[PDB]
Amino acid sequence: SKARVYADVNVLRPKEYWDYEALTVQWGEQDDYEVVRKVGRGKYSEVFEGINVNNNEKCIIKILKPVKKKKIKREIKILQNLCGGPNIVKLLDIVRDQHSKTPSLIFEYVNNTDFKVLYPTLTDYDIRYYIYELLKALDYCHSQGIMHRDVKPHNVMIDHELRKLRLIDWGLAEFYHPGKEYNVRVASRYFKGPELLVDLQDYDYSLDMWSLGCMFAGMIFRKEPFFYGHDNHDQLVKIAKVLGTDGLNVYLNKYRIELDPQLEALVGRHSRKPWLKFMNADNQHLVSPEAIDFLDKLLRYDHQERLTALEAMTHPYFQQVRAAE
Numbered sequence: 001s002k003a004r005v006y007a008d009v010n011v012l013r014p015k016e017y018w019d020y021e022a023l024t025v026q027w028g029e030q031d032d033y034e035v036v037r038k039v040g041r042g043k044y045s046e047v048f049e050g051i052n053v054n055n056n057e058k059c060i061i062k063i064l065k066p067v068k069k070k071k072i073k074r075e076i077k078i079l080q081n082l083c084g085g086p087n088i089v090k091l092l093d094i095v096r097d098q099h100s101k102t103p104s105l106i107f108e109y110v111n112n113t114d115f116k117v118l119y120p121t122l123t124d125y126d127i128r129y130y131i132y133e134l135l136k137a138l139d140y141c142h143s144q145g146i147m148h149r150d151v152k153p154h155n156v157m158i159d160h161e162l163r164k165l166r167l168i169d170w171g172l173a174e175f176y177h178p179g180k181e182y183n184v185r186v187a188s189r190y191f192k193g194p195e196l197l198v199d200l201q202d203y204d205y206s207l208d209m210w211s212l213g214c215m216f217a218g219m220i221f222r223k224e225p226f227f228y229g230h231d232n233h234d235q236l237v238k239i240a241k242v243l244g245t246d247g248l249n250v251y252l253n254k255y256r257i258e259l260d261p262q263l264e265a266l267v268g269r270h271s272r273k274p275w276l277k278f279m280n281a282d283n284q285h286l287v288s289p290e291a292i293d294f295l296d297k298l299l300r301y302d303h304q305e306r307l308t309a310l311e312a313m314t315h316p317y318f319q320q321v322r323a324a325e
């Protein structure tokens, strides 16, 4: 399997562009940035609102937790390659603690409101507007030969007051190379695409389109997360319970995938549950036929069937957003 778009981006660009292992970090000055307050955390890092001492400009300080040198060069290279793209967080500097050599990635300041409190207040139009903004970021990174591999609400910072969006945490991102077999242990469980759940290693940019689909479904249906599986095995079951097993079987045979006996047993046999079956008094104001058609074209078992970020942006669902632009 290969991407249906941007497949040769890294094939045509010089080795230095994607050969991140050959990167030699130009460490800046650790004293230039001061922590002001913590604002977040993850299994791989701690994030603080900071201040650039030279210009007293606010910034974001991401202190990385101990991890392999390769992974750190990877995140840095991708950040340097995407800097300046639409809605892509901007890496401003890279410093390290002299004594322990703990790395810190310095970014432009980003204002944010946790999705569990922001999302409930979004209007039908806000949702169209912000998803469109996210799609710009995804079409861009894909056009540059990179898969984010961890699209989820937590990684989409939004400054609702200024209606500004940024795609963050490129710590799991990778460069796409035709035919390469990647690690399937990426993204977050509720947003893992079927390819990751059934061990299809030669996946591509389309992976992010499933994750986006899950996020979108949660937003219009007010059911977060939309696919709530306890572990990887269960994650596929919850998915099968909605899209139906027939579609799953067509998919597995096309890619010659062997489902683990145990897992196959858990999935079972299920009919498809129409999207409208998910509409209720709490989400009726956000569910529209255009929203359903868009979502339907994203959540497909077969990754080659999903809409590309570029295709997604032209769907009539975003008509007024484009018109506004």
Ligand SMILES: O=C1c2c(O)cccc2C(=O)c2c([N+](=O)[O-])ccc(O)c21
Residues within 6 Å of the ligand: 039, 040, 041, 042, 045, 047, 060, 062, 089, 107, 110, 112, 168, 169, 170
């Ligand atoms: O990784 C990031 C991150 C980044 O890579 C670039 C800019 C901002 C953030 C960020 O803000 C953030 C937060 N958080 O919301 O506090 C929580 C967990 C994270 O892993 C991050």
